[PDB]
Structure 1
Amino acid sequence: ASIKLQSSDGEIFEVDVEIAKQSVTIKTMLEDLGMDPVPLPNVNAAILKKVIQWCTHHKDDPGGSGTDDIPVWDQEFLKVDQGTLFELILAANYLDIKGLLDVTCKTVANMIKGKTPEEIRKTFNIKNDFTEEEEAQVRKENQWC
């Protein structure tokens, strides 16, 4: 039950088939053609290694997360560099792994919660871009009761 996964720069990763099908993106390529090696042109090696770790950890359980508290392990798993986090957010989206998407996007969401923005601003390097008077007009308009 062994399947070959080929990084965006070749790389290894011989994972158990149940663990690979966990990505729909893959499960559907494994049905196009036999596909022996499996070319993943978007996910590099560093990232895919994480992706496999996450999948091998949740292999025996899936179902119903969504807006459920991020579990303790995923919390650690995700104590990563910010850019690395977004890189996971893309792999999850590319490999279509719902669970990894939920938990990475939710962790990003939790960062934005409770900021000024001016915090939200520092945190993600976003361009101020409201001219002098532009502010008040959006700030009174964005005061949710």
Structure 2
Amino acid sequence: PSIKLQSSDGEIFEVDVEIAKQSVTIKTMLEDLGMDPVPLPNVNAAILKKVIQWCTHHKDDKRTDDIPVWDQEFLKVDQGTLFELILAANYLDIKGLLDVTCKTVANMIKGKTPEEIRKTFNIKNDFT
């Protein structure tokens, strides 16, 4: 019931096979390629921790208007980290997490002007 995950920076984590399998990617590495240590070439250790707790908290289961209070506080981190989570959720294919992180960015956009947007997200003005 325990599988071993490995971050890009080398650290190893032992997570339950079910929690770990919320990551389609991880799941498919486990099942069609009997990989025990499962290296995640893109996710570093700091990020895997978050990912793991997120999956753990959801082992048992728009708007921004429906983001579970827990998930909200979970995403209470700096852009840097937020950016890394969206990317990590995409590579690992953990729908739910990808789901909440996306709405979270969405909400950061809602209400602002393109300019405000360019500023909070450090986006270059292509038309200039």
* TM-score bin (small chain): over 0.9
How many residues end up aligned between the 2 structures? 125
In the aligned structure 2, how far is the partner of 1:83 from the partner of 1:52? Answer: 18
| Distance 1:36-1:114 versus aligned 2 partners, 3 A rule | same
Q: Point out which structure has higher relative CO (alpha carbons under 8 A, 6+ apart).
A: 2
The alignment-based identity, stated in percent, is 100
Offset, 1:116: 1.4
- TM-score, with structure 2 as normaliser: 0.92
List per-residue Cα deviations over 1:79-130 (Å, max 9, x = no partner): 1010110100011100000000010011000000011122112101111243
Residue of 94, 111, 119 corresponding to 1:122: 119
* Larger Rg over CA atoms: 1
Gaps of 5+ in 1: 62-66, 132-145
Q: Secondary structure at the match of 1:34?
A: coil
**Residue ranges of structure 2 left out of the alignment (5+ in a row):** none
Please list, as runs of the form range in 1=range in 2, the aligned pairs for 1:4-83 lying within 5 A after superposition.
4-61=4-61, 69-83=66-80
The equivalent residue for 1:139 is none
Give the aligned CA root-mean-square deviation in angstroms. Answer: 1.3
> Matched residues in 2 for 1:37 and 1:103: separation?
28
Runs of 4+ in 1 over 2 A off after TM superposition: 128-131
Structure 1 residue 68 displacement after superposition? 6.0
Secondary structure, aligned partner of 1:100: helix
More strand per residue: 2
In 2, Cα distance between equivalents of 1:96 and 1:88: 11
When the two structures are superposed, what TM-score results if normalisation uses the length of structure 1? 0.82
Question: 1:34, CA displacement in angstroms?
Answer: 1.8
